[PDB]
Design a protein around this ligand. Sequence first.
Ligand SMILES: Nc1nc2c(ncn2[C@@H]2O[C@H](COP(=O)(O)OP(=O)(O)O)[C@@H](O)[C@H]2O)c(=O)[nH]1
Ligand SMILES: Nc1nc2c(ncn2[C@@H]2O[C@H](COP(=O)(O)OP(=O)(O)O)[C@@H](O)[C@H]2O)c(=O)[nH]1
Lengths: 429, 429
Amino acid sequence: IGSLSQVSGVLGCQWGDEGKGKLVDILAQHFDIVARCQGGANAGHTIYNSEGKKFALHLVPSGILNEDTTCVIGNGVVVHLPGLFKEIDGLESNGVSCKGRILVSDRAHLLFDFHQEVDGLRESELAKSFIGTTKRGIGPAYSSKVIRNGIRVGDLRHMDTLPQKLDLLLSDAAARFQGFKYTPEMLREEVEAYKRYADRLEPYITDTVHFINDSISQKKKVLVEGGQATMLDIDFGTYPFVTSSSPSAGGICTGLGIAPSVVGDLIGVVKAYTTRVGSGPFPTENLGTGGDLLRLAGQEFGTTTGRPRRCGWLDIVALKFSCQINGFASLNLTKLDVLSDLNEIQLGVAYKRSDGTPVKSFPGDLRLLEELHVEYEVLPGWKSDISSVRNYSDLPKAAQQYVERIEELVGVPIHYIGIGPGRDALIYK
Amino acid sequence: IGSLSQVSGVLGCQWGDEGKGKLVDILAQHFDIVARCQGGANAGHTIYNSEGKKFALHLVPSGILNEDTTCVIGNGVVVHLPGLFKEIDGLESNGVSCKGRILVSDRAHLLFDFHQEVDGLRESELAKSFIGTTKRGIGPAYSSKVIRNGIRVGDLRHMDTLPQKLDLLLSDAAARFQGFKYTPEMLREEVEAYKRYADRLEPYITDTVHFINDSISQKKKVLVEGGQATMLDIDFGTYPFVTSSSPSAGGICTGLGIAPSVVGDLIGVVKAYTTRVGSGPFPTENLGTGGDLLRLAGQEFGTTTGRPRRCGWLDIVALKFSCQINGFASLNLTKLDVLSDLNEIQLGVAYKRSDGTPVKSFPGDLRLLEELHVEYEVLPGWKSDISSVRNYSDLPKAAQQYVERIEELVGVPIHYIGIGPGRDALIYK
Ligand SMILES: Nc1nc2c(ncn2[C@@H]2O[C@H](COP(=O)(O)OP(=O)(O)O)[C@@H](O)[C@H]2O)c(=O)[nH]1
Ligand SMILES: Nc1nc2c(ncn2[C@@H]2O[C@H](COP(=O)(O)OP(=O)(O)O)[C@@H](O)[C@H]2O)c(=O)[nH]1
């Protein structure tokens, strides 16, 4: 743990809910800075302190629980101020003092209220391939960024031109969707509202790129927190069933201003099995007993909705893919304890076409991904409670073998084994 | 030169026309693969072969002149098929055989004809300050990618659904801009057109991610080609006066599927001074005779338009910035020969606010970037022709000192010095 590189990172290997939050929180004990690089409020990093208090971070980096840690919100992120403050409010009321510990990049883009209303207006137009995003507005935010008419955090320091920028964004949104209720009164609404936010955010705004780099040359330890998993990447994911950001290792560079040569060891958080929140390709998805079971044992339900999340077996093909894309040094096999009630465990060892020809690497073509079939391997499951095991060799032999099997197949070793939602529930290897 | 890492790369440090094309063409001799990772057709890499023929690449990687080199168009790119073929056509008629040498990623997005018409509709609609783009539609291309409704290269293998995707994109475009002439006839137009493109492009389409990665473990040499310069990066540039892609080192990872730990030595192409094609923040801009002379000796005029480009002194503040963002190993100081007529050469050494407070690092705030003033340094120029100098020590002492000074202020060594547009006009150090 203390042998990690000066600039380490934590990324997701599957489809989003691996359990990075827990890891970052545990790792932040030996890191000066914890910085998020991509995504937005769409997250939901759940952590439990030393006592057992349930903290569900969204924008604020998971390392916010460590008092001697400076949290940085990078440039690749899309901050929604109303929500950011609300998160800070309820964070300080629960103990953690966020004063001068949350550095918000001035190059990061502002996700506005209209961005959220606009995202949803497009959902009622989608066919059977609708996204799972409940009007969050991540797409529209990055849309504006790329178009180059979006507003950034540093733009809040020029309240004179802010209403001018606002008009355009709102004009674009009104011209597009007829359902968008746009009035000259609503323009003045967010202008006054964001003015208060601008005054409030002021102390927070800082040059992230400069800070990170300066800190790095100052020998300060930096732990980058992966927004989501790579299979949700805008490029390497299961397009179009992905997020608009870059959960990949590249997003650390583009989202923080760090050179590739500066990025150190990356730990890929892999769940003992797999899950997927929205719709789309899922090769190892189980729609029966084992599926309903993994969901209950892992409590794989929406936190805000309670909607059942798709469950399946650890996809080895999809995992080797994420391993090469990010070049992970180590892996964090989470939710191992979920497999404690399994008689026999399965692994998605290979892909093969309808016709029989083996599939090379994880394909980008959604169709081929929904046509092919998986070749499983069955490992003997241990049937004993393990949420109390602290050492490695104390683990049931069947469990050890499962871990060791994933390593043999993937090539990347596992140094972290999660066996419970607890902060202390982690087996080092 | 042969000491370069297995996976090298060449990126731009200023605002676009540094001279990478020349360099990649020169470096391609010792590389098995040359791959573009970001941007689109907006490029204009000019190169001269052994004889003196002027080749102006756009989409095809600059290493296309080397017969034993397989060019790869990564996934971060936005290919406009009509233009790509037109380029391949006029390329093969000029000698170079592109058969089985241009590998087009299946995960790359397709820049459509409507994307170009749409892009131009937003500039004429806007009042006052524009962008200065030739209406190539790079922005809208990435817009759709982010929105996740954009069509990719691999989607051409499913002609049955292709017309469905088209309708959405065109619907989005028509709903937004009233000026967009959309008819059910123009839909079928591009459908039949792109069917032909699909059949023709078929041989080219390959899994870029897999190819690159597999090739790399096979010990094949890969030279990544930087689209443009980092000061034009969507994040680290001078927003909103930047491109929609990531010309940064990160773009190599997100645009190719290469892990940061895999990316080797990056070479930063720096002009002996600075230029800027469009409008926007340009600290070192010289509106006097100094810029006039600088422009003429450098031939800084649009190739397609003939428009005069903004000229200035080598910005050290902007250069150190790009150097930390990409973490360059070496630099390629280009167009040195342009300063051969200069009595004295200046360097933008520091930034200072209106009140006097020093501006730490390169700022993101465009306003601050247009308010601050630059503190220059004046070095004695050599007044001799050097376009024929082959060895380093053969260069006038004043020239050597200029080179060594840039290395002292920046911290990154210069191993390549350009003294002419020629293929052979490069001094190694
Ligand atoms: N049962 C169990 N829960 C775990 C384990 N590791 C983490 N968790 C919990 O699983 C949930 C996954 O974390 P979440 O915040 O949703 O994932 P994130 O996407 O990385 O933010 C959290 O409630 C964790 O405390 C484990 O080994 N077993
Ligand atoms: N005088 C002079 N011209 C150069 C030198 N290096 C490159 N050039 C010219 O300027 C161009 C530089 O940018 P260009 O190729 O248009 O695109 P890039 O890919 O952004 O470099 C070259 O193609 C040459 O014609 C140099 O050392 N001296």
